[PDB]
Amino acid sequence: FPATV
Amino acid sequence: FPATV
Amino acid sequence: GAMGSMERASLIQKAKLAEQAERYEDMAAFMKGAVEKGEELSNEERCLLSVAYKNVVGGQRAAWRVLSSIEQKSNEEGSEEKGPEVREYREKVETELQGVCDTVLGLLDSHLIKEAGDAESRVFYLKMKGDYYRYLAEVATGDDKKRIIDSARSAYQEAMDISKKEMPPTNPIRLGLALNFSVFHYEIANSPEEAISLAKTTFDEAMADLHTLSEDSYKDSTLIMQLLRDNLTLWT
Amino acid sequence: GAMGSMERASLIQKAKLAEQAERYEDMAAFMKGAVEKGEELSNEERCLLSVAYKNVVGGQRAAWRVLSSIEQKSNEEGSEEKGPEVREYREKVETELQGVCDTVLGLLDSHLIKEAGDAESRVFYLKMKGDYYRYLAEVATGDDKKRIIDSARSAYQEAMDISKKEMPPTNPIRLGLALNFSVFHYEIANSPEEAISLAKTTFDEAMADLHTLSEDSYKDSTLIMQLLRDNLTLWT
Ligand SMILES: *SCCN[C@H](O)[C@H](c1ccccc1)N(C)[C@H](O)OC(C)(C)C
Ligand SMILES: *SCCN[C@H](O)[C@H](c1ccccc1)N(C)[C@H](O)OC(C)(C)C
Ligand SMILES: [Mg+2]
Ligand SMILES: [Mg+2]
Ligand SMILES: [Mg+2]
Ligand SMILES: [Mg+2]
Ligand SMILES: [Mg+2]
Ligand SMILES: [Mg+2]
């Protein structure tokens, strides 16, 4: 999965 | 801590 | 509310203790109680709220993905009928996830966003609103799915508009908002080109502003810039 | 019971799904429902029960240790008074932990142990009874603390007596029972010499029996033997 914050 | 199972 | 009898300061204190103990459900319940005291949140308190629910819903999303994957394999050709159990349990986790998202969105709507006037608080809460509609969109399949997606998009867009007008391009909240809105484009809105364009422009505009920053601010901004780069590398 | 309307087989199926999703609270609630159907448990089902509650209470113990450590520092010389919050929250986690232990002990008493006639099931359940009294003992400070410790010791001792008579010295349940009873001696009963003696004798007697085993049994037994050795190295 792509990075989120 | 020591190992337990 | 079960936290109605506890002091606001005690709820914040215990949220921090729960974080140290990695008890994120407790942390979220304490911060929910703190929000419901009706006073605005400080920068640090906004962080405690977002950290708590991010960990709670993050665990639910991870579990939902495991179960949805098992469910998909069960519906493939040649798979043995195992009964309704996989769907039932995926639905149970899904309903609990939706419940948490509805709770967070409820706190933002009653009444965090309407009282948030400074850019750093308003952008923060609108990013959260976009994020939790995005999590609802990840599991959505019904009549309102397009409206859930548009609710995420609308919140992200308002946050972007404010952040571009009121925050420097290296601001960590602005950067994290752009990171997540880019992921929304890629994974939710089927717009990988917009996702890549946003991540690249955000990265490049932050790069050009790093020279204005202290050592400590530089470290904060470059940390999130590296996440933008990680996504770009994933996508190109 | 909230699981009273679900089929036993569906509860077992969902326990396995919960394990895959790392949803151990769900896993434990499903296995509690399965036990309360009143039928005996198979070897695999006993494993599902123990895995679920081991993970649930393991997380609670880790959190309790974090909070108890913070509480102890708050009570040292020169520490600022922070109010009752740390004690309150440690007590909250402690009460929830005690609740889980009481639940497990309740399942063993009503009526898993009394229906368990084979060595492999009876030793398994008595080890569990010793373990969950041991977790109660870790947080005990009151009038009944010595009785909690003796309840753990008594359950462990009955399990040891049966395991020595009815199981080979390489049996993994016998080995794991001895591992944990040794830790009980070291950490609960203030008997490090008994802890070391038990771990060494258990290891040596298993070593001498490995030659009787298949490749797959050998791997199972040596895995737990290495834990005995790890503890001995920690303690000597
Ligand atoms: S809780 C806000 C503090 N964290 C940062 O602002 C940023 C962020 C951005 C947007 C939304 C939530 C959090 N963090 C992701 C980064 O990691 O924080 C530092 C300052 C770079 C450590
Ligand atoms: S759930 C029982 C299966 N696991 C093993 O018997 C053993 C054990 C012993 C006593 C109580 C619980 C579990 N495991 C610790 C070990 O690890 O299992 C193998 C067979 C060595 C993998
Ligand atoms: Mg007050
Ligand atoms: Mg649903
Ligand atoms: Mg643009
Ligand atoms: Mg039936
Ligand atoms: Mg107590
Ligand atoms: Mg002896």
Side-chain angles (χ1 to χ4, degrees), chain A, chain B, chain C residues 1-75 78-236, chain D residues 1-75 78-236:
Chain A
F1 49 87
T4 52
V5 300
Chain B
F1 49 87
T4 52
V5 300
Chain C
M3 303 297 179
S5 65
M6 202 185 308
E7 290 275 19
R8 187 187 191 280
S10 302
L11 289 161
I12 298 297
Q13 187 176 350
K14 294 179 180 182
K16 290 176 190 168
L17 292 173
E19 185 184 23
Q20 290 183 90
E22 301 176 89
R23 293 266 299 197
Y24 292 107
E25 298 214 326
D26 288 351
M27 193 188 176
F30 290 140
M31 289 310 298
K32 181 178 186 285
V35 169
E36 289 168 352
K37 299 302 175 178
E39 306 270 358
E40 299 187 25
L41 302 191
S42 68
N43 298 332
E44 180 176 11
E45 297 162 352
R46 285 192 302 275
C47 276
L48 292 167
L49 176 72
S50 68
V51 163
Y53 280 108
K54 165 175 176 63
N55 276 270
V56 165
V57 73
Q60 297 173 314
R61 293 162 71 213
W64 184 96
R65 291 177 187 173
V66 165
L67 300 174
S68 180
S69 169
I70 295 170
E71 187 180 14
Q72 289 178 92
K73 293 175 293 184
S74 83
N75 288 328
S79 300
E80 275 299 319
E81 184 54 50
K82 298 297 170 43
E85 285 89 356
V86 170
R87 171 190 60 75
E88 286 169 354
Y89 186 48
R90 187 268 303 156
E91 285 173 338
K92 175 194 188 165
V93 176
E94 181 175 302
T95 298
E96 180 192 300
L97 182 159
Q98 288 168 327
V100 169
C101 293
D102 288 345
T103 291
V104 174
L105 292 167
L107 296 173
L108 298 169
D109 201 50
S110 303
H111 303 274
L112 287 169
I113 289 172
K114 71 175 50 73
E115 295 295 352
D118 295 356
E120 281 245 355
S121 62
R122 195 168 182 85
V123 171
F124 193 96
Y125 294 133
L126 287 166
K127 173 183 173 297
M128 284 185 64
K129 182 173 185 177
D131 287 338
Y132 283 86
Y133 274 112
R134 171 161 59 89
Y135 307 150
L136 291 176
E138 288 177 336
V139 309
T141 60
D143 281 0
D144 60 356
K145 174 181 184 50
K146 284 174 172 163
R147 271 178 289 266
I148 293 170
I149 292 173
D150 203 64
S151 287
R153 179 211 57 77
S154 180
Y156 280 137
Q157 189 61 61
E158 184 176 354
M160 292 286 307
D161 295 345
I162 301 173
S163 75
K164 291 194 197 192
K165 192 188 326 297
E166 302 289 340
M167 286 168 160
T170 47
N171 180 280
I173 297 175
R174 176 166 169 182
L175 291 174
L177 161 66
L179 180 80
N180 289 17
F181 193 24
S182 166
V183 166
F184 165 85
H185 289 307
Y186 196 94
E187 294 286 346
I188 308 300
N190 197 30
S191 307
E193 286 176 336
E194 186 71 14
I196 292 160
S197 174
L198 179 54
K200 182 171 203 310
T201 289
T202 302
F203 181 98
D204 292 343
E205 281 192 84
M207 178 68 56
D209 191 55
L210 290 171
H211 75 273
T212 68
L213 302 179
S214 72
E215 189 159 339
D216 283 356
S217 292
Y218 181 89
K219 166 171 152 32
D220 292 339
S221 300
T222 54
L223 189 142
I224 306 166
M225 292 173 64
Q226 183 60 49
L227 303 175
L228 290 159
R229 171 68 42 195
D230 291 341
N231 284 358
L232 283 166
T233 297
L234 192 53
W235 294 338
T236 59
Chain D
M3 303 297 179
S5 65
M6 202 185 308
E7 290 275 19
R8 187 187 191 280
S10 302
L11 289 161
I12 298 297
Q13 187 176 350
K14 294 179 180 182
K16 290 176 190 168
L17 292 173
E19 185 184 23
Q20 290 183 90
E22 301 176 89
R23 293 266 299 197
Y24 292 107
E25 298 214 326
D26 288 351
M27 193 188 176
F30 290 140
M31 289 310 298
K32 181 178 186 285
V35 169
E36 289 168 352
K37 299 302 175 178
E39 306 270 358
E40 299 187 25
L41 302 191
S42 68
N43 298 332
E44 180 176 11
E45 297 162 352
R46 285 192 302 275
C47 276
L48 292 167
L49 176 72
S50 68
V51 163
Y53 280 108
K54 165 175 176 63
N55 276 270
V56 165
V57 73
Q60 297 173 314
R61 293 162 71 213
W64 184 96
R65 291 177 187 173
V66 165
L67 300 174
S68 180
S69 169
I70 295 170
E71 187 180 14
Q72 289 178 92
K73 293 175 293 184
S74 83
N75 288 328
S79 300
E80 275 299 319
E81 184 54 50
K82 298 297 170 43
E85 285 89 356
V86 170
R87 171 190 60 75
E88 286 169 354
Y89 186 48
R90 187 268 303 156
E91 285 173 338
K92 175 194 188 165
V93 176
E94 181 175 302
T95 298
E96 180 192 300
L97 182 159
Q98 288 168 327
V100 169
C101 293
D102 288 345
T103 291
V104 174
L105 292 167
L107 296 173
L108 298 169
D109 201 50
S110 303
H111 303 274
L112 287 169
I113 289 172
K114 71 175 50 73
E115 295 295 352
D118 295 356
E120 281 245 355
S121 62
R122 195 168 182 85
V123 171
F124 193 96
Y125 294 133
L126 287 166
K127 173 183 173 297
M128 284 185 64
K129 182 173 185 177
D131 287 338
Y132 283 86
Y133 274 112
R134 171 161 59 89
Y135 307 150
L136 291 176
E138 288 177 336
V139 309
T141 60
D143 281 0
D144 60 356
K145 174 181 184 50
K146 284 174 172 163
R147 271 178 289 266
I148 293 170
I149 292 173
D150 203 64
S151 287
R153 179 211 57 77
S154 180
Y156 280 137
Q157 189 61 61
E158 184 176 354
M160 292 286 307
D161 295 345
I162 301 173
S163 75
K164 291 194 197 192
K165 192 188 326 297
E166 302 289 340
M167 286 168 160
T170 47
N171 180 280
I173 297 175
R174 176 166 169 182
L175 291 174
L177 161 66
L179 180 80
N180 289 17
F181 193 24
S182 166
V183 166
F184 165 85
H185 289 307
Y186 196 94
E187 294 286 346
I188 308 300
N190 197 30
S191 307
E193 286 176 336
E194 186 71 14
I196 292 160
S197 174
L198 179 54
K200 182 171 203 310
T201 289
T202 302
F203 181 98
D204 292 343
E205 281 192 84
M207 178 68 56
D209 191 55
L210 290 171
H211 75 273
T212 68
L213 302 179
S214 72
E215 189 159 339
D216 283 356
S217 292
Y218 181 89
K219 166 171 152 32
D220 292 339
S221 300
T222 54
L223 189 142
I224 306 166
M225 292 173 64
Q226 183 60 49
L227 303 175
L228 290 159
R229 171 68 42 195
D230 291 341
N231 284 358
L232 283 166
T233 297
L234 192 53
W235 294 338
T236 59

Short mmCIF file of all heavy atoms in Angstrom, two decimals, chain C residues 85-116:
data_model
loop_
_atom_site.label_atom_id
_atom_site.label_comp_id
_atom_site.label_asym_id
_atom_site.label_seq_id
_atom_site.Cartn_x
_atom_site.Cartn_y
_atom_site.Cartn_z
N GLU C 85 -19.90 -17.79 6.60
CA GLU C 85 -19.12 -17.32 7.73
C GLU C 85 -18.12 -16.23 7.33
O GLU C 85 -17.94 -15.26 8.07
CB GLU C 85 -18.40 -18.50 8.38
CG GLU C 85 -19.35 -19.36 9.20
CD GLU C 85 -19.99 -20.47 8.38
OE1 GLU C 85 -19.78 -20.53 7.15
OE2 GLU C 85 -20.72 -21.29 8.98
N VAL C 86 -17.44 -16.40 6.19
CA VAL C 86 -16.42 -15.43 5.80
C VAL C 86 -17.05 -14.07 5.53
O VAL C 86 -16.57 -13.03 6.01
CB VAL C 86 -15.64 -15.93 4.58
CG1 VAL C 86 -14.75 -14.83 4.04
CG2 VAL C 86 -14.80 -17.13 4.94
N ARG C 87 -18.14 -14.05 4.76
CA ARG C 87 -18.86 -12.81 4.51
C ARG C 87 -19.38 -12.20 5.81
O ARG C 87 -19.24 -11.00 6.03
CB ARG C 87 -20.02 -13.04 3.53
CG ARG C 87 -20.93 -11.84 3.40
CD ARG C 87 -22.21 -12.16 2.63
NE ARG C 87 -23.05 -13.20 3.24
CZ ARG C 87 -23.81 -13.04 4.32
NH1 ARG C 87 -23.85 -11.88 4.97
NH2 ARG C 87 -24.54 -14.06 4.77
N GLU C 88 -19.95 -13.03 6.70
CA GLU C 88 -20.48 -12.51 7.96
C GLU C 88 -19.40 -11.82 8.76
O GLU C 88 -19.60 -10.72 9.28
CB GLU C 88 -21.09 -13.64 8.79
CG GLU C 88 -22.43 -14.10 8.25
CD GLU C 88 -22.91 -15.39 8.90
OE1 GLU C 88 -22.15 -15.98 9.69
OE2 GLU C 88 -24.05 -15.82 8.62
N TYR C 89 -18.23 -12.45 8.86
CA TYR C 89 -17.19 -11.89 9.71
C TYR C 89 -16.54 -10.68 9.05
O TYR C 89 -16.23 -9.69 9.72
CB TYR C 89 -16.17 -12.97 10.07
CG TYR C 89 -15.14 -12.49 11.07
CD1 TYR C 89 -15.52 -11.82 12.22
CD2 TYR C 89 -13.79 -12.68 10.83
CE1 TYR C 89 -14.56 -11.35 13.12
CE2 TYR C 89 -12.83 -12.21 11.72
CZ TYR C 89 -13.22 -11.55 12.85
OH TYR C 89 -12.26 -11.07 13.71
N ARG C 90 -16.37 -10.70 7.72
CA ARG C 90 -15.92 -9.49 7.04
C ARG C 90 -16.92 -8.35 7.25
O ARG C 90 -16.53 -7.21 7.48
CB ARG C 90 -15.71 -9.78 5.55
CG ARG C 90 -15.08 -8.63 4.76
CD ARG C 90 -16.11 -7.70 4.13
NE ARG C 90 -17.03 -8.41 3.25
CZ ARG C 90 -18.25 -8.00 2.92
NH1 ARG C 90 -18.74 -6.85 3.41
NH2 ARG C 90 -19.00 -8.74 2.12
N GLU C 91 -18.22 -8.66 7.20
CA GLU C 91 -19.24 -7.64 7.45
C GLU C 91 -19.16 -7.13 8.89
O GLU C 91 -19.41 -5.94 9.14
CB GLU C 91 -20.64 -8.21 7.16
CG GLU C 91 -20.96 -8.35 5.67
CD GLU C 91 -22.30 -9.06 5.40
OE1 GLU C 91 -22.78 -9.81 6.27
OE2 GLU C 91 -22.86 -8.89 4.29
N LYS C 92 -18.85 -8.00 9.84
CA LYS C 92 -18.75 -7.57 11.23
C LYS C 92 -17.62 -6.58 11.40
O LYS C 92 -17.79 -5.51 12.00
CB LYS C 92 -18.53 -8.77 12.16
CG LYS C 92 -18.30 -8.37 13.62
CD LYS C 92 -17.76 -9.52 14.45
CE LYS C 92 -17.71 -9.17 15.93
NZ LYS C 92 -17.53 -10.40 16.76
N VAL C 93 -16.44 -6.91 10.87
CA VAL C 93 -15.30 -6.00 10.94
C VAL C 93 -15.61 -4.72 10.18
O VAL C 93 -15.31 -3.61 10.65
CB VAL C 93 -14.03 -6.68 10.42
CG1 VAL C 93 -12.88 -5.68 10.40
CG2 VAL C 93 -13.69 -7.87 11.31
N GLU C 94 -16.24 -4.84 9.01
CA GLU C 94 -16.59 -3.68 8.20
C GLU C 94 -17.53 -2.74 8.95
O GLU C 94 -17.36 -1.51 8.92
CB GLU C 94 -17.23 -4.15 6.90
CG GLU C 94 -17.63 -3.05 5.94
CD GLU C 94 -18.14 -3.63 4.65
OE1 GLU C 94 -17.37 -4.38 4.01
OE2 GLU C 94 -19.30 -3.37 4.29
N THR C 95 -18.53 -3.29 9.64
CA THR C 95 -19.48 -2.46 10.38
C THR C 95 -18.79 -1.75 11.54
O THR C 95 -19.09 -0.58 11.84
CB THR C 95 -20.64 -3.33 10.87
OG1 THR C 95 -21.31 -3.88 9.72
CG2 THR C 95 -21.61 -2.52 11.67
N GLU C 96 -17.85 -2.43 12.20
CA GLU C 96 -17.13 -1.80 13.30
C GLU C 96 -16.24 -0.68 12.78
O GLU C 96 -16.16 0.39 13.40
CB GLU C 96 -16.31 -2.88 14.03
CG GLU C 96 -15.48 -2.39 15.20
CD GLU C 96 -14.50 -3.44 15.68
OE1 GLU C 96 -14.96 -4.54 16.07
OE2 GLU C 96 -13.26 -3.17 15.64
N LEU C 97 -15.59 -0.90 11.63
CA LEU C 97 -14.79 0.14 10.99
C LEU C 97 -15.65 1.35 10.63
O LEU C 97 -15.27 2.50 10.88
CB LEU C 97 -14.13 -0.44 9.74
CG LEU C 97 -13.17 0.39 8.86
CD1 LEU C 97 -12.30 -0.56 8.06
CD2 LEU C 97 -13.92 1.31 7.91
N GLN C 98 -16.79 1.10 9.99
CA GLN C 98 -17.70 2.19 9.64
C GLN C 98 -18.13 2.95 10.88
O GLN C 98 -18.24 4.18 10.87
CB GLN C 98 -18.91 1.64 8.89
CG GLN C 98 -18.55 1.20 7.50
CD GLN C 98 -19.65 0.39 6.84
OE1 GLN C 98 -20.38 -0.36 7.51
NE2 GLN C 98 -19.76 0.51 5.52
N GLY C 99 -18.34 2.22 11.98
CA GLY C 99 -18.72 2.87 13.22
C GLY C 99 -17.67 3.84 13.72
O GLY C 99 -17.99 4.94 14.17
N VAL C 100 -16.40 3.43 13.67
CA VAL C 100 -15.32 4.32 14.09
C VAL C 100 -15.25 5.54 13.17
O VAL C 100 -15.12 6.68 13.64
CB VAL C 100 -13.97 3.56 14.12
CG1 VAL C 100 -12.81 4.55 14.28
CG2 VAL C 100 -13.97 2.54 15.23
N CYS C 101 -15.33 5.31 11.86
CA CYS C 101 -15.29 6.45 10.94
C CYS C 101 -16.43 7.42 11.21
O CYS C 101 -16.22 8.64 11.21
CB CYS C 101 -15.34 5.97 9.49
SG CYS C 101 -13.88 5.05 8.95
N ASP C 102 -17.64 6.89 11.43
CA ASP C 102 -18.78 7.75 11.73
C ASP C 102 -18.56 8.53 13.02
O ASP C 102 -18.96 9.69 13.12
CB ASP C 102 -20.06 6.92 11.84
CG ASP C 102 -20.56 6.38 10.50
OD1 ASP C 102 -20.11 6.87 9.45
OD2 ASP C 102 -21.43 5.48 10.51
N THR C 103 -17.95 7.89 14.02
CA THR C 103 -17.63 8.58 15.27
C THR C 103 -16.68 9.74 15.04
O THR C 103 -16.91 10.85 15.53
CB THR C 103 -17.02 7.59 16.26
OG1 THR C 103 -18.03 6.66 16.68
CG2 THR C 103 -16.48 8.33 17.48
N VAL C 104 -15.60 9.51 14.29
CA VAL C 104 -14.63 10.57 14.04
C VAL C 104 -15.29 11.69 13.25
O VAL C 104 -15.14 12.87 13.58
CB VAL C 104 -13.40 10.03 13.30
CG1 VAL C 104 -12.47 11.18 12.91
CG2 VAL C 104 -12.65 9.02 14.18
N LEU C 105 -16.01 11.33 12.19
CA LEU C 105 -16.68 12.36 11.39
C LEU C 105 -17.68 13.13 12.23
O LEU C 105 -17.85 14.34 12.05
CB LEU C 105 -17.37 11.72 10.19
CG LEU C 105 -16.37 11.16 9.18
CD1 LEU C 105 -17.07 10.25 8.17
CD2 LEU C 105 -15.62 12.31 8.47
N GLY C 106 -18.33 12.44 13.17
CA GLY C 106 -19.24 13.12 14.08
C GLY C 106 -18.55 14.14 14.96
O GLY C 106 -19.11 15.20 15.24
N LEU C 107 -17.34 13.82 15.44
CA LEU C 107 -16.61 14.78 16.25
C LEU C 107 -16.20 15.99 15.42
O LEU C 107 -16.24 17.13 15.90
CB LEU C 107 -15.37 14.11 16.87
CG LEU C 107 -15.60 12.97 17.87
CD1 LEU C 107 -14.29 12.32 18.26
CD2 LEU C 107 -16.29 13.49 19.13
N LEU C 108 -15.77 15.75 14.18
CA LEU C 108 -15.40 16.86 13.31
C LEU C 108 -16.61 17.74 13.03
O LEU C 108 -16.48 18.97 12.98
CB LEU C 108 -14.81 16.32 12.01
CG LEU C 108 -13.52 15.51 12.22
CD1 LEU C 108 -13.16 14.78 10.92
CD2 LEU C 108 -12.37 16.40 12.66
N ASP C 109 -17.78 17.14 12.85
CA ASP C 109 -18.97 17.91 12.52
C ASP C 109 -19.62 18.55 13.74
O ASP C 109 -20.37 19.52 13.59
CB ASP C 109 -19.99 17.02 11.82
CG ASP C 109 -20.99 17.82 11.03
OD1 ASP C 109 -20.55 18.69 10.25
OD2 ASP C 109 -22.21 17.59 11.19
N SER C 110 -19.35 18.03 14.94
CA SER C 110 -20.00 18.50 16.17
C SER C 110 -18.95 18.58 17.29
O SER C 110 -18.90 17.71 18.17
CB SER C 110 -21.17 17.58 16.55
OG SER C 110 -22.12 17.47 15.49
N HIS C 111 -18.14 19.64 17.32
CA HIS C 111 -18.23 20.80 16.43
C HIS C 111 -16.83 21.33 16.10
O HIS C 111 -16.61 22.54 16.03
CB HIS C 111 -19.08 21.92 17.06
CG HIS C 111 -20.46 21.48 17.42
ND1 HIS C 111 -21.50 21.51 16.51
CD2 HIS C 111 -20.96 20.94 18.55
CE1 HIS C 111 -22.59 21.03 17.09
NE2 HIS C 111 -22.29 20.67 18.32
N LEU C 112 -15.88 20.42 15.88
CA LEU C 112 -14.48 20.82 15.74
C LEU C 112 -14.26 21.73 14.54
O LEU C 112 -13.61 22.78 14.66
CB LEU C 112 -13.60 19.58 15.64
CG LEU C 112 -13.42 18.82 16.96
CD1 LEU C 112 -12.74 17.47 16.70
CD2 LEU C 112 -12.64 19.64 17.97
N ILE C 113 -14.79 21.36 13.37
CA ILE C 113 -14.49 22.12 12.16
C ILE C 113 -15.08 23.52 12.24
O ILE C 113 -14.41 24.51 11.91
CB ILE C 113 -14.96 21.37 10.90
CG1 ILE C 113 -14.05 20.16 10.67
CG2 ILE C 113 -14.88 22.29 9.68
CD1 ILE C 113 -14.52 19.22 9.57
N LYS C 114 -16.34 23.65 12.70
CA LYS C 114 -16.97 24.96 12.65
C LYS C 114 -16.32 25.96 13.59
O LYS C 114 -16.42 27.17 13.35
CB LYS C 114 -18.48 24.86 12.93
CG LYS C 114 -18.83 24.53 14.35
CD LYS C 114 -20.33 24.57 14.57
CE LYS C 114 -21.09 23.75 13.53
NZ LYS C 114 -20.97 22.27 13.71
N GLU C 115 -15.62 25.50 14.63
CA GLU C 115 -14.92 26.41 15.52
C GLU C 115 -13.46 26.61 15.15
O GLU C 115 -12.78 27.39 15.81
CB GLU C 115 -15.03 25.94 16.97
CG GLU C 115 -16.47 25.95 17.53
CD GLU C 115 -17.08 27.36 17.62
OE1 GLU C 115 -16.36 28.37 17.42
OE2 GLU C 115 -18.29 27.46 17.91
N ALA C 116 -12.96 25.94 14.11
CA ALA C 116 -11.54 26.00 13.77
C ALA C 116 -11.33 27.12 12.76
O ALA C 116 -11.75 27.01 11.60
CB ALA C 116 -11.07 24.66 13.20
#
